Design an enzyme around this catalytic site. Structure first.
Site, mmCIF file in Angstrom:
data_model
loop_
_atom_site.group_PDB
_atom_site.id
_atom_site.type_symbol
_atom_site.label_atom_id
_atom_site.label_comp_id
_atom_site.label_asym_id
_atom_site.label_seq_id
_atom_site.Cartn_x
_atom_site.Cartn_y
_atom_site.Cartn_z
ATOM 1 N N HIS B 39 1.868 12.111 0.869
ATOM 2 C CA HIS B 39 1.672 11.515 2.183
ATOM 3 C C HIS B 39 2.958 10.941 2.762
ATOM 4 O O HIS B 39 3.073 10.832 3.986
ATOM 5 C CB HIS B 39 0.594 10.432 2.118
ATOM 6 C CG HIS B 39 1.084 9.117 1.595
ATOM 7 N ND1 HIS B 39 1.111 8.817 0.251
ATOM 8 C CD2 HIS B 39 1.551 8.021 2.235
ATOM 9 C CE1 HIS B 39 1.582 7.593 0.086
ATOM 10 N NE2 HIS B 39 1.857 7.089 1.274
ATOM 11 N N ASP B 61 -2.354 13.660 -4.165
ATOM 12 C CA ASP B 61 -1.340 13.091 -3.279
ATOM 13 C C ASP B 61 0.019 13.016 -3.979
ATOM 14 O O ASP B 61 0.656 11.964 -4.051
ATOM 15 C CB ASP B 61 -1.782 11.716 -2.767
ATOM 16 C CG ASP B 61 -0.969 11.244 -1.577
ATOM 17 O OD1 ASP B 61 0.008 11.928 -1.209
ATOM 18 O OD2 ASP B 61 -1.312 10.187 -1.007
ATOM 19 N N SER B 113 6.553 3.071 -1.519
ATOM 20 C CA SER B 113 5.845 4.055 -2.322
ATOM 21 C C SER B 113 6.835 4.971 -3.032
ATOM 22 O O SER B 113 7.881 5.329 -2.483
ATOM 23 C CB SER B 113 4.904 4.876 -1.449
ATOM 24 O OG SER B 113 3.912 4.052 -0.862
#
Lengths: 52, 161, 161
Positions: B39, B61, B113
């Site tokens: 993502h 993901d 992230s």
């Protein structure tokens, strides 16, 4: 022409479904530094032939 | 001692991802595979790592690729054991209790992230995706490993950082 | 102590192989069988060893033969256990980490092929064929033994020495 086109469409759809199922089954094995389960390797051909 | 070792590993094994001039995430080198959450969008701030072909899987993901030969010595080492206790992180210490990763301070920020969570011996355990605000704490939606399987743990209400 | 014993064992269990007057590889005695890498070319500097019938196999890149009776006491003792850690070598100490044999020095040079990799107790673990340049390190392409089987481990990009 109609019958030939329908046959080609159906065979392409089936081949695409096989390829997608293969990719979906063998996708998690490239996200780990692990082995490919030669039992599954024999049935499900993958790009890594000997390495990994 | 442990902090210096962890930071030294993080310097050689983590790369920022550049997109529109602003950082969006990090790509880390674990074992022999390039790591990046799917993502998070951008390009690796590295010429060699930018040209690799990435295998995408939206179920977990994650996007992975085979690391080049000449960066194999500058990559972390991993493990699949998760005993109860505490684990190190770039933003402090993380509490692992009952199969959950929890942030004591709730100090997570979007754009962070892709920062691996380390073990006590400097090994990597899991890769963070986002956090869910549970009161004063913040549970981590993280991508962890079994012996040979990837599993994606996502607590309710997680937001993708 | 350990270094002296290892070099004494290497002296008694290594014979130079020379081609056109210059050495190109080494053939070593392990257990009760003469072992030499197949890819190296030349003849062994020994009347008894050079006359034997060497069995060939290209898959494992190895030549093997049965030693005569009067050199059985001059042969190393083998093993199959490979615990993680450090092992001895002629050019230093080798590191076993994550199923790989790596050279901390990265000083591997052509012509060192066939030298055994030694254990703590002087046991032989594997045989060196070549290595791959991992920047500051080099991953070794070595031939080891299982309980009853031979395997070849070749990291990507390896070159035969």
């Amino acid at each position: 022409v109609g019958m030939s086109l329908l046959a080609l469409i159906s065979i392409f759809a089936s081949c695409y479904m096989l390829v997608a199922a293969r990719s979906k089954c063998l996708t998690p094995y490239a996200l780990t530094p692990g082995a490919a389960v030669p039992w599954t390797l024999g049935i499900l051909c993958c790009a890594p032939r000997a390495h990994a | 001692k442990r902090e210096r070792m962890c930071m030294k590993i993080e310097n050689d094994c983590i790369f920022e991802v550049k997109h529109e001039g602003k950082v969006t995430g990090y790509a880390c080198l674990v074992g022999d595979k390039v790591m990046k959450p799917a993502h998070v969008k951008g390009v690796i701030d590295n010429a060699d790592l930018a040209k690799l072909a990435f295998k995408k899987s939206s179920k977990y993901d994650l996007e992975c690729a085979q690391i080049p030969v000449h960066m194999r010595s500058d990559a972390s080492k991993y493990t699949h054991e998760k005993p109860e206790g505490h684990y190190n992180w770039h933003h402090g210490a993380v509490q692992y209790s009952g199969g959950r990763f929890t942030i004591p301070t709730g100090a997570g920020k979007p754009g962070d992230s892709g920062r691996p969570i380390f073990d006590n011996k400097g090994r990597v355990v899991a890769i963070v995706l986002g956090g869910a605000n549970e009161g004063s704490r913040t549970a981590l939606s993280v991508v962890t490993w079994n012996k040979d399987m990837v599993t994606r743990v996502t607590p309710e209400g997680s937001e993708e950082w």
